[PDB]
Amino acid sequence: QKDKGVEPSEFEDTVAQAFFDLENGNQELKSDLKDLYINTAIQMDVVGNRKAVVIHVPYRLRKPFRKIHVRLVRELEKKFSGKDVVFVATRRIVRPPKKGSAVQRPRTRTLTAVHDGILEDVVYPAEIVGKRVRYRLDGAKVIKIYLDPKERNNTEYKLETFSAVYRRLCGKDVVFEYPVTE
Amino acid sequence: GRMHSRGKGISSSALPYKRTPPSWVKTAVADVDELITKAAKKGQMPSQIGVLLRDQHGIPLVKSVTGSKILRILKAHGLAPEIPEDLYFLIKKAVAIRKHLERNRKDKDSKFRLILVESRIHRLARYYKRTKKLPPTWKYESTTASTLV
């Protein structure tokens, strides 16, 4: 459901009804929808038009959704159009350990190591093959990401949606690109 | 360069940037775990288990498919050897050198190599003691070393 409290927003109702509805209409996707549905759903319009929706698998159901993320969003195409639905995973970001504070806060799931841990979630069907960081003269560093050339799908027009989503989820400017070779 | 030579060779491996296992790998974690455990039962060792997995069973890198190193997998399963592999092979080489040098007292070049290998053995043993990978009472006794291997 959601991390704290009992009453979520007014937006999750549409996605919950879509979850309860979309199962009826598939053969394999129908069966494997007994997992915890969502934790939050947030809308965010991108520059110009074609607003986007961001959903949060808790943590553990992320691996099963990689098996359906290829179809689910496509199956979610026959839904509230004007959508760019993207799934991420909610993660703890514990800063706590101070100068003392012998607590270790494992160096795997640190703070802002989640930042690059949500980055490939937004682009799950296309795995990143390269990353560069350019530090501009105004202190306005940008991140350029080379995704795998095997696009073969709608990953081409989601780049600005990914940029807006990352800007509103981590406060970083990211511009995507593709290799010239293949 | 080399610790005990003047060489400057740089030949090594180059792991791919893509940390995820390749798509064509259709082997589950359970099969890899069972294969590693069976190999460790057959007296193999992590370095020579990784190569067997890479060649025969088409597993490019264990840390990718299973998410953890071979030594960690064996230690979690409890099949890990009592002595680290590199120290074991260094001790084996030193034992072979001593066995050969016993009958050739004038071969004053294998004595120098023996000194070098004993120095490497002692350095590695000190490191493994510092990280509690060996008992603090461990000691390399040359006469009884061959019984260990």
Added chain:
Amino acid sequence: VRVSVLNDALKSMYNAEKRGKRQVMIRPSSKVIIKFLIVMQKHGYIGEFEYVDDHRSGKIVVELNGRLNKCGVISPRFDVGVKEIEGWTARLLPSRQFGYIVLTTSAGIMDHEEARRKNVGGKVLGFFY
């Protein structure tokens, strides 16, 4: 062995600058190297530079604009207070009109004028002018 990556970075950059190169490659990268380069770029002594992720230690490609005369580290990192900065200025710098000394104070990595502004001290990383 590589005991100070900052010295290797600064020395390679200075050597490339003397030869009139327009780009230089620095390997391996690190956060302190990035902060030193950021200070130098902010004061207008270099231009663009991009960090390349090689998944192991990262490289930096830096664009030179010909404005950098010398840049070099100071080893070991001596500790200087606010009252000693002047003395080091009389040693590492051509004149009081320009030049910069980089300090790693507990408020971050900065130049010596900024350290005097904030009235803080620290260790000396290097210098550039």
Added chain:
Amino acid sequence: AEQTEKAFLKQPKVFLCSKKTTKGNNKPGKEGNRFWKSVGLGFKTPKEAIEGTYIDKKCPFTGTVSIRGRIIAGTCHSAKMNRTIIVRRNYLHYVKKYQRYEKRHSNIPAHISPCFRVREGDHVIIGQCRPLSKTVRFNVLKVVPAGSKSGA
């Protein structure tokens, strides 16, 4: 028992033969009771000093010695003695001409009460007291075993 000498060992001013009961009488050491005190300075009296049978007049917790002066941390150097250890205090001396530090050390003999179990290389915290011997002027106040402070 704790009596291993040719004289009976007892805590001073602690009457050991009162007929009236105990275990509820304030100031432990009244009507027959182990006498113990808190040394202050934010130090915790060990349970082995309150519920103990040893007798030590030089112990800071159950003795006649009061801790005042300087508090010094260090590492145990040699503990081959009878209720006394050597504490090694490592520091850095600043050679001014060369603006550089040289490693220095200084051994300090300290008295360790029978409530503290110690080993070579342990991390000890000691506090200055009145002279107890020719060289002993400190009492061990805390012992942390080597290779510790774990948990995350």
Added chain:
Amino acid sequence: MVLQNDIDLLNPPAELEKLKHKKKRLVQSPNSFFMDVKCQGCFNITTVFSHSQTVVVCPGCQTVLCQPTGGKARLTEGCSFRRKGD
């Protein structure tokens, strides 16, 4: 080829790095690959490493496929080679 003043280190030519040492490339990459060797008969799915070190066999007749050498494994003349990739 005056010097790197004309080329761009950020975007170097895509073929010159096909020849440099793997460590010395802009981003380190392996020079090997995996191949599914197909025998003359059936059982054509066996997967082998390019720079293999163990003499692999086949379920049918053990059909010795490759010999380990100082570099790429010496595939036999009778065994057909095609490569699998990411």
Added chain:
RNA sequence: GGCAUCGUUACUUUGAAGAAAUUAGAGUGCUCAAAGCAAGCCAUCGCUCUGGAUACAUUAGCAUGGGAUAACAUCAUAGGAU
């Protein structure tokens, strides 16, 4: 006014305590100066509460803030946290 119980240091900032004399330094026309800590003024049965400033003073010690750069052990039999 609360109320805890805490990785340790180096480094850096701010504070305190810090003998005078000497040194630097403010005032002051000993006729100048080296000096001295005196003096100055309405032309008084006196006044300026006259002044007799201020720094620095390694290192070690005490206390406040900072955590960038460094050193120690702490790091997966859960003997972990709630």
Added chain:
RNA sequence: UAGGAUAGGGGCCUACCAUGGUGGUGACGGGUGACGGAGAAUUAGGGUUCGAUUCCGGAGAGGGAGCCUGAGAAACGGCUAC
């Protein structure tokens, strides 16, 4: 550990017990035409050399030792001995 002695802590001394204590981070031993410090000379900075002497602390009254009186001395412009 227990006493003795002291104005008082303490191998300061006695009886018994244990085998410890310091050292290439220089113990131990030797040289000093070595009292220590505040300070002095020269000083771009760093530094080098000096510091018996009037301010602070210590030690001595030809060389050692013992002591009375006294609140305070192992006093010497006090005693006793060599």
